[PDB]
Design a binder for this molecule. Structure first.
Ligand code: 5ZF
Ligand code: 5ZF
Lengths: 304, 304
């Protein structure tokens, strides 16, 4: 019993964090095989934040301008390239602790674990969702850039996010491990705002199924609903539209609870139209949307 | 910016988790140097849950009745003893991945990280508080027993919790690493209640300081209060009484924000007396009490 914001174990990712310094700037890199990945803004200075020409700036740099440090050991940069918004530093030593890994581009509403790092040293781990507007609501200070987001399938670490910057709201933006930013953001000091963020409907439904599995059954109602009718109520409360793919994805929890998806949807509508009257579901006074149906199945089936 | 329930990196603890089997029962053990620690209930069977005489049960066991498995390696048990509610299995090989560690008995209201394990394999990591009533509100399934709670100071792992059981309300109970239970609980199937759990007042104040630091300031009011005055209101809402030591402990956040502690108390008082009016602080619709002043400082200063 119980339901917590649970991260994956971070050990495999800890062994891959290094410190990358270029001139004055210090930020975290990810060391896999004989390559270190980090944010390309590491090569900027203050004069160049409003509109850097990275191509130009990168040309003014040589291999020896990049100091890479893993623990106390200094690694030798024998190459450097830029892939979209990431710098790839080629080093003469493959990481002995390189896990089985993939790079994946995740979809909005999916979750991952963040290993928040400073000076190449892991500081903490937490679970995050990629918001519909392609930001993440993380917890990151100055120096956190290069910190990575990941999911672990058995032995394979799937890297899906690299932290690049904080926005005016205080939300965070970043890229996949191929340097492509999630959303419409750019690595420069300019006016950037995220779009309207919606609530991940399928995630709230999964969390409600988790509540039932944990005995919090009050919100359950005597009414059912239809996709069309629910989706009309959803648009009003800035909830993402629910698809049959979402209905199909929730099947495992429906079968374990004996509660059909559309009956769960009808209970959400009432919580949306009538509020929670001051009660709490799974310790929260608001509807949570950062848990996927998989996250819920995992935290209720005990996957290791 | 941002504020999340953040766990410590779990890598150091991952390398210490093993699988302990005695007869039919499998659970998790902690392998440090040449000793494996696990819950003594591993030696029990179904007929013996209501009132086991462990001394007696243990006498029916020899070294070879204990299977310890770390990954695929089977370790050889060369000794066994019982310390309070933990079994200590002596093995012939010291753990090569043993971190610098201590065993600590933590105070109520303190926090720690849990590495939830099944079959000796890490599954997930999350942050918990030891409740005033000496339970924890965790997320553990069958097979979780022997999973541990810890804090990491630099390279030093302080083990403070081993999971032993789930109580009727589905909160969890366990021991320190000397096998002394937190609270009045015993390792048998009897009826055990936690009694009244209060809110950790000092942690709520810390969290409020976290909010201010993150720009959430609506709840700040034009009042101050006194310790006595505040505590009279705290007792009414089952908040732990605030001491001068708690006041001293909040000094960093106080100095950082330039908001005096007693002024923050007066703001808590109104929130308690008036509720939050359906507003939120740091993405929550209720007052959070599972972050310590240290957790807050750490998350708002960048410790690794
Ligand atoms: C831990 Cl691997 C587990 O699956 N248990 C559990 C704990 C303790 C015992 C036990 C105690 C004394 C003698 C023999 C065996 C057995 C199983 C789960 C659990 O605590 N069930 C509770 C209801 C229980 C308490 C006391 C005795 C028996 C059962 C458990 C389940 C979920 C999360 N954590 C632990
Ligand atoms: C990352 Cl180590 C960091 O401390 N930054 C940061 C990000 C990006 C840049 C940058 C961008 C383009 C050219 C040069 C440098 C510098 C610093 C923090 C940050 O994002 N500050 C924001 C306001 C910023 C955005 C864009 C440009 C400059 C600054 C930061 C702070 C807190 C959490 N994460 C990141």
């Amino acid at each position: 019993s119980g339901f917590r914001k649970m991260a994956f174990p971070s050990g495999k990712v800890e062994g891959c964090m290094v410190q990358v310094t270029c001139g004055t700037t210090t930020l975290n890199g990810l060391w896999l095989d004989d390559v270190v990945y980090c944010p390309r803004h590491v090569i900027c200075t203050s004069e160049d934040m409003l509109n850097p020409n990275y191509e130009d700036l990168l040309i003014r740099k040589s291999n020896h301008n990049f100091l890479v440090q893993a623990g106390n050991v200094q690694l030798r940069v024998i190459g450097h390239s830029m892939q979209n918004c990431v710098l790839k530093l080629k080093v003469d030593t493959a990481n002995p602790k390189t896990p089985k890994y993939k790079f994946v581009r995740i979809q909005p509403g999916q979750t991952f674990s963040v290993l928040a790092c400073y000076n190449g040293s892991p500081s903490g781990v937490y679970q995050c969702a990629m918001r519909p507007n392609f930001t993440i609501k993380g917890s990151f200070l100055n120096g956190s850039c290069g910190s990575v987001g990941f999911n672990i399938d058995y032995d394979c670490v799937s890297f899906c996010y690299m932290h690049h910057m904080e926005l005016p709201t205080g939300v965070h933006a970043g890229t996949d491990l191929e340097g492509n930013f999630y959303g419409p953001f750019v690595d420069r000091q300019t006016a950037q705002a995220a779009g309207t963020d919606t609530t991940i409907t399928v995630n709230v439904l999964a969390w409600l199924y988790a509540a039932v599995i944990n005995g919090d059954r009050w919100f359950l109602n005597r009414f059912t609903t239809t996709l069309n009718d629910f989706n009309l109520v959803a648009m009003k409360y800035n909830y993402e539209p629910l698809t049959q793919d979402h209905v199909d994805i929730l099947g495992p929890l429906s079968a374990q609870t004996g509660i059909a998806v559309l009956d769960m949807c009808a209970s959400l509508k009432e919580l949306l139209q009538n509020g929670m009257n001051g009660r709490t579901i799974l310790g929260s006074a608001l509807l949570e949307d950062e848990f996927t149906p998989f996250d819920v199945v995992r935290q209720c089936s005990g996957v290791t």
